Design a protein around this nucleic acid. Structure first.
Lengths: 300, 24, 158, 167
RNA sequence: ACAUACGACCAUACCUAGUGGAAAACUCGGGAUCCCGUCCGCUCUCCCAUAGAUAAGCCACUAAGGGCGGGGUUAGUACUCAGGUCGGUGACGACUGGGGAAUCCCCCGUGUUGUAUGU
RNA sequence: AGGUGUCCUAAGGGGGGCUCAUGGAGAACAGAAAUCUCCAGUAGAACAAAAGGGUAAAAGUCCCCUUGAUUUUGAUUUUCA
RNA sequence: AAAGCGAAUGAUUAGGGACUCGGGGGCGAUUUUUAGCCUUCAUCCAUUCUCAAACUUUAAAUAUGUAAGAAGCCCUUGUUAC
């Protein structure tokens, strides 16, 4: 009829791709170009800013490459803004801009440059890069890092640029251009510099709250349930988000406890093992096969 | 008012009716 | 009869079987310095900065380092004399060689054997030597008795 | 156990193949505009064939896709023409189905002589909820064996919902 | 031990079929004013983390499964380097000093690991 | 056993989305073959031309912008004295 | 060189099982648009007899590149417009 394509031969000739390409998480055509270092410089590392988005969280890391695996310099999860006073809207621009600022100040203190490279300290919708600052007769060029957007799509106004903007304000020198920030009009090729500032303080969701409550009452209560529960109104978001900046820049090291059950690492190991499944031995496998033969004959 | 972009590929510079040879 | 730059390189520059597509990225993370011992092995999938078919398998010494390539020195044998050639190759075609690795390992132990022996008071016997003929020993036949063999007759198998 | 496996209408795709270029397309396109509410698409003849008399890269057909409540109501109109009866051979082994009509005004279009008369093709595709896994860009995969539709379910679903019959 | 993010070796990890999954994570999911893009909010983009479910993805186990990896047998066989005033009309073959493979067929196995945070 | 005295403002350069040939099953005229839909599909398609090598979120394919097909001289490779 | 084709490409001998609407020749009323009984090609599946200078998953013997240090190894710290 039709020759069977998926024959045994087909399997033998089949070649599989890389493991992470099978899973669909890495772009090796692009990874190759983020990590290669010009051979004139020998061991100067390349610093990548990686950003990933789950449904309920945003992951930001600072990474260097090594011949046996990557190395993590400093990590900043979005969900650790509970201590800083945020409990709602964990995946907005404000959430992204905040965790970007967090990681920037987290790495500087670790590497011993917190006193210098102040940054801006008052967000504004302006396009600026971190310039070198004269100190005690020394010109010290700022820290450098590059952005790794992964498999996401780079359109105008995506959140990937938000965390990027936060790191730049923190003091890390991230090279970029202002042609993708929210509020750039392609027809006039110029920013507006006030729609931008609304996006760092969260105003674009506050307008949604008030507009929705006016028109559709039942939808408004069904979407903003927990905003209402903790009685946080639209006019307080700017003060909330501005207030977060103060504590985070004051200290980026406060640790909080969550509501998940907690134990020591040894205790967990004993807990997990019970639910494991033990493989079968050769004698058991041979015995069960023997039984199956008898059963089939008995059925006949 | 829009034109679909066909996935199928054809030889770069050929002006040939489809070669079948099967059935009539 | 023709002589092109890649004449007769049908099987040399080819990739293997079930080795196609992506290049393992660990190649791009190695580092080289002048005086290192490298050996050339060309990859067919990369057409930029690749060497002539003669140097596919040779071994040389790095003498220059650049953005994405290294300069290697190798010795060519023309009739009745040697010449030294200086070629530029991309790092995708090169690899660090284990030719001197045995020498480096041996010299370290030699130093420390000599140091330790000088503190104790016994001679060294450090330099190696070839395989000498065997020495006398005894073989018992307890619980191992010999079996007698004999040639076998002729017979047709098909 | 069937917690959430209820079938839905992902989309309805319908097309008209006049088979020859010219103003027949433009008027045929106008038909789809008034019926659906969206703007249609033009195809391109892949392979020229003298027999039928068509050359390559010559627009010969039009089609449009619809999803949601619009798709439901358009499907309902179509089945009313077909008398809520279909043939057993109209269902694929994978779970899809479709049919066709002969003259485009078996439903209400209020005929005008400046357009003409045409015929349409309907084809309707089923699915189970949760098929983003095979269409999202990052971490793509194939739906598992158990969770895919076969022919017996769709006819079973169709019979109860519309109280139809199959021959 | 398990999960997530970035990886290394790149099927012992692939393909088909059947069963189970404490905790958290992950995922499906709900809406389309604003940024953004489509014939269609299908994909891409924005917003909510409330509600529903492990059905699928993911993880684990099973199959005298296909394939893959390691080993034995084929075998000191086929082949080959050096030698003789060795045999035979020739085709070709045996011997002396050395090196030495590959199918069919049989057995076993079904991923290992680095950095950071958390269960 | 065969091939060259050409061809290209894109068939060069950068970036971005997509996956092919073909087979199975369906849909008014429509049929062996026109257009639409789902599944499988390791390259069995395509890359100006002779043959060989190479390529799958591409080196193919469609879309957006350009002229590194520019200026100054040196070093090195194959044929080789 | 050898080896291989119940492994890709190409060449090539023979039975068996599954199928009829793929083609042809009959029979049951040549009724035959009867998924009937026969069958002759053709097509799939598990097997079988032979081959490749311009085929290959494998893979020798003989020959071939490099190294076997005092111009070596280890420790501290001066120069620079990179």
């Amino acid at each position: 009829f039709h020759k069977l394509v998926k024959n045994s031969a087909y399997y033998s000739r089949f070649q599989t791709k890389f493991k992470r390409r099978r899973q669909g998480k890495t772009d090796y055509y692009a990874r190759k170009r983020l990590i290669t270092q010009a051979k004139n410089k020998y061991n100067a590392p390349k610093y990548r800013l990686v950003v990933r988005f789950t449904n309920r969280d945003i992951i930001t890391q600072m990474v260097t490459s090594e011949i046996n695996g990557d190395k993590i310099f400093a990590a900043a999860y979005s969900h650790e803004l509970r201590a800083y006073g945020i409990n709602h809207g964990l995946t907005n621009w404000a959430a992204a801009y905040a965790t970007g600022l967090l990681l920037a100040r987290r790495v500087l203190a670790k590497l011993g440059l917190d006193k210098t490279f102040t940054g801006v300290e008052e967000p504004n919708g302006e396009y600026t890069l971190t310039e070198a600052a004269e100190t005690e007769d020394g010109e010290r060029r700022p820290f450098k890092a590059i952005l790794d957007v992964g498999l996401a799509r780079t359109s105008t106004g995506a959140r990937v640029f938000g965390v990027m903007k936060g790191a730049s304000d923190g003091g890390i020198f991230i090279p970029h251009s202002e042609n993708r920030f929210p509020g750039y009009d392609i027809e006039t090729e110029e920013l507006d510099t006030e729609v931008l500032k609304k996006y760092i303080y969260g105003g674009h969701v506050a307008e949604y709250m008030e507009t929705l409550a006016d028109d559709d009452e039942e939808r408004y209560k069904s979407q903003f349930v927990k905003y209402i529960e903790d009685d946080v109104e639209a006019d307080s978001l700017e003060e909330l988000y501005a207030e977060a900046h103060k504590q985070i820049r004051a200290d980026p090291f406060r640790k909080y406890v969550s509501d998940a059950p907690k134990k020591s690492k040894e205790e967990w190991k004993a807990e997990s093992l019970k639910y494991k499944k033990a493989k079968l031995s050769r004698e058991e496998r041979k015995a069960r096969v023997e039984a199956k033969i008898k059963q089939l004959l008995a059925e006949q | 008012a829009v034109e679909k972009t066909s996935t199928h590929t054809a030889k770069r510079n050929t002006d040939g009716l489809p070669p079948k040879g099967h059935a009539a | 009869h023709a002589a092109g730059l890649r004449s007769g390189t049908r099987y040399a520059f080819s990739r293997g079987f079930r080795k196609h597509g992506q290049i393992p990225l660990s190649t791009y993370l190695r580092t080289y310095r002048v005086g290192d011992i490298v050996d050339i092995k060309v990859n067919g999938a990369v057409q930029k900065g690749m060497p002539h078919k003669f140097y596919h398998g040779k071994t040389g010494v790095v003498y220059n380092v650049t953005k994405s390539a290294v300069g290697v020195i190798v010795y060519k044998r023309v009739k009745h004399r040697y010449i030294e050639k200086r070629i530029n190759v991309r790092i995708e075609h090169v690899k660090p060689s284990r030719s001197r690795e045995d020498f480096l390992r041996r010299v370290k132990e030699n130093a420390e054997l000599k140091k330790k022996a000088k503190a104790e008071g016994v001679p060294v016997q450090l330099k190696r030597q070839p395989a000498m003929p065997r020495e006398a020993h005894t073989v018992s036949i307890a619980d191992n008795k010999p079996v007698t063999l004999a040639p076998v007759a002729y017979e047709t198998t098909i | 156990q069937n917690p959430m496996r209820e079938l839905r209408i992902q989309k309805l795709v319908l097309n008209i193949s006049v088979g020859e270029s010219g103003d027949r397309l433009t008027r045929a396109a106008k038909v789809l505009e008034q019926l659906s509410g969206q703007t249609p698409v033009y195809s391109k003849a892949r392979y020229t064939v003298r027999q039928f008399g068509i050359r390559r890269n010559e627009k010969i057909a039009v089609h449009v896709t619809v999803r949601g409540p619009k798709a439901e109501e358009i499907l309902e109109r179509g089945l009313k023409v077909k008398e809520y009866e279909l043939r057993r051979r109209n269902f694929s082994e994978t779970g899809n189905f479709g049919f066709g009509i002969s003259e485009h005004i078996d439903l209400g279009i209020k005929y005008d002589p400046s357009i003409g008369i045409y015929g349409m093709d309907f084809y309707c595709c089923m699915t189970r909820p949760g098929e983003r896994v095979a269409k999202r860009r990052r971490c793509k995969s194939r739906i598992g064996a158990s969770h895919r539709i076969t022919r017996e379910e769709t006819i079973r679903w169709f019979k109860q919902r519309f109280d139809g019959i199959v021959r």
